[PDB]
Design a protein around this nucleic acid. Structure first.
Ligand SMILES: [Zn+2]
Ligand SMILES: [Zn+2]
Length: 51
DNA sequence: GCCACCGGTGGC
DNA sequence: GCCACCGGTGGC
């Protein structure tokens, strides 16, 4: 299988802007991680099978 | 080139 | 043995 995509319909997916205050927003330059408030509810579940 | 998922792992 | 952290890179 392939990498999973965001769902588009949970509250975080619907957020227009980054929150600007979580650990990942404060470390924008460094982080390869999405704003904690934009993280898709569906992607917080571990993959049923890995890659 | 950017966004950001996710396998791999160091420190506990 | 867990898991927060990271960084390579898939997908656009
Ligand atoms: Zn944030
Ligand atoms: Zn979502």
């Amino acid at each position: 299988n392939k990498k999973r995509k965001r769902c588009g319909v949970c509250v975080p997916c619907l957020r227009k802007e980054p929150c600007g205050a979580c650990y990942n927003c404060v470390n924008r330059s460094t982080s390869h991680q999405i704003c904690k408030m934009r993280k898709c509810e569906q992607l917080k579940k571990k993959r049923v099978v890995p890659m």
